[PDB]
Amino acid sequence: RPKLYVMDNGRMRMDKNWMIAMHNPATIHNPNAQTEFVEFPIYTVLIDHPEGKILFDTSCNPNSMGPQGRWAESTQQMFPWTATEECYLHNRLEQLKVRPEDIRYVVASHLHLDHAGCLEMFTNATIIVHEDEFNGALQCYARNQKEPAYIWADIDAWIKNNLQWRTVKRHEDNILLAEGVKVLNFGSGHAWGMLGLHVELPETGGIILASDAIYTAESYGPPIKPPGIIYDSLGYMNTVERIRRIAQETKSQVWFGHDAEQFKKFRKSTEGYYE
Amino acid sequence: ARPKLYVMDNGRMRMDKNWMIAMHNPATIHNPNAQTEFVEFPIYTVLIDHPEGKILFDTSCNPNSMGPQGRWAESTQQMFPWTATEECYLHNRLEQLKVRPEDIRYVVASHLHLDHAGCLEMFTNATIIVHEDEFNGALQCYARNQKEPAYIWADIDAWIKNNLQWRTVKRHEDNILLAEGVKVLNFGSGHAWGMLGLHVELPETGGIILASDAIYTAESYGPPIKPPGIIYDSLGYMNTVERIRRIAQETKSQVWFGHDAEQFKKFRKSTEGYYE
Ligand SMILES: [Co+2]
Ligand SMILES: [Co+2]
Ligand SMILES: [Fe+3]
Ligand SMILES: [Fe+3]
């Protein structure tokens, strides 16, 4: 029945120390060690399920980068996003003959700039988000805090567009969204509140969408290599190991949030789908 | 009780500033290969000559730490090089104050990192006070022959062989009144598995909090708080820092960081005097 699509929403670059912390430490021999600006894919996942279309993540807002962009210049220069018009989410969905208003559920893994970019589009969906992540982002907004990963203007848009929210409580069990689609409540780690997705496809079988719970295969290991972007180190480690257990017990693949090698090997919306 | 508190200079260490201050200098689009720096910082310990008995806070690095025949692994020596003279060695610092290791009643181990638990093995007449989670963590690295850089296998080996007398601070244990005006602070998990601090109330100087690696430097402390790269429990670290700030305010105490070069220079070291 279900069809799962991988949509390419462009690329982002940043200090590798964000991705893998202390990836290249200074030594007595390399006292002035240098980092690297690494490139990684931003992507989203559409599940065209009989019970309704489910969208996982929403990438960046088209009006993010640029001198007249939503992102602060310090953010733009730290986490530059590069994307043709075909990469924009609205376009990727159009290509699939899917309108925003057709989306029943949006699962926001978290509310970082490269995941919650286009939430404002989905005014007919229920937006599922971790309550702690929602609280965290709302505070940034209210306190006009200068947090690089949370876009004041994006949040401003969510409120103005009157999105319909469904917060996953801190100690809430996983949610059965649809047949073979379960929202996993990962809790605090990479961010305040992380959500994942387990999808059971008839043919493909089990998929875990880990998002930023696991940046890359290098993150996953073993051994685990945590990021520099991190709120709760203990929770982050617990989440990874938990994912590892779930993958084993359910014989699922783990789809990382920003692994280039894996993304290349994915079947994109333009090419086809998983079923 | 009219005690005397000594700061002993146990050398200097250097390491990537990212260890000390996480993401201190992130690469950007127009600076994509941003480079880090190798910052130098002091290793010190504190002796409290107290009428009820002598209390030592931290023990610095082991004399046979560095070198080809050293206890530290080469990768450790290269990432966290320790430079010190014979006078900087704790045993010598104590000797110059006419103190023998056997005269130490209590050793408080802030944690069991290489630069704080180096010389525990000296104090075979003392009760070593350590956080149980820290002790457990270190013992695991030992038993698993794990290669954690901050935990020295040979140091731990020595503690066991010397039959040290331990007193573990339990995870949910209250502060310990060690002596009049000396309280062991249970900071719990953060920088490491289990952090201990000290609150000292001196007649003349007033209140001092020894934070060790709960707070690396004034830069760490802020505000704003700038967390380290060497972290186990991020949330616990931040809670601890905020807790120290509150205690400091309420008790009107100075906060002595673990490795603040500037603060260290201002201290009256053991070669010059003490704090009453
Ligand atoms: Co993120
Ligand atoms: Co330490
Ligand atoms: Fe991300
Ligand atoms: Fe230290």
Author numbering:
A (entry chain A): 9 to 283
B (entry chain C): 8 to 283
Paper text:
MLLs degrade N-acyl-L-homoserine lactones (AHLs), molecules that are used in a microbial communication system called quorum sensing (QS) to coordinate a variety of behaviors, including virulence and biofilm formation. We provide the structural and biochemical analysis of the lactonase GcL (WP_017434252.1), isolated from the thermophilic bacteria Parageobacillus caldoxylosilyticus. GcL is a thermostable, highly proficient lactonase with broad substrate specificity (kcat/KM values range between 104 to 106 M–1 s–1) for substrates such as N-butyryl (C4) L-homoserine lactone (HSL) and N-decanoyl (C10)-HSL. The binuclear center, common to all MLLs, is coordinated by five histidine residues and two aspartic acid residues.
We report here the kinetic characterization of several variants, including Ala157Gly, Ala157Ser, Gly156Pro and Ile237Met. The Gly156Pro variant exhibits larger changes in preference, with a 254-fold drop in catalytic efficiency against C6-HSL. Intriguingly, the decrease in substrate preference does not change linearly with the increase in chain length but shifts 2.3 and 6.8-fold for C8- and C10-HSL, respectively. This suggests that subtle substrate conformational sampling may occur differentially as a function of chain length (and, by extension, as a function of the acyl chain hydrophobic character and entropy). To gain some molecular insights into the effects of these substitutions on the active site configuration, structures were solved for both Gly156Pro and Ile237Met variants. The structure of the Gly156Pro variant reveals that the Asn152-Ala157 loop is significant in accommodating long chain AHL substrates. The conformational change in this loop may be responsible for the altered substrate preference of the enzyme. We used MDpocket70 to locate the hydrophobic/hydrophilic regions of the cavity along with the MD simulations of C6-, and C8-HSL in complex with wild-type GcL and Gly156Pro variant. Interestingly, the end of the C6-HSL acyl chain, which is the most mobile part of the substrate, lays in the same position as the rearranged residue Glu155 side chain, creating strong repulsion and destabilizing the substrate. In contrast, the end of the C8-HSL acyl chain lies further from the active site and the repulsion between Glu155 and the substrate tail is diminished, allowing tighter binding of C8- compared to C6-HSL.
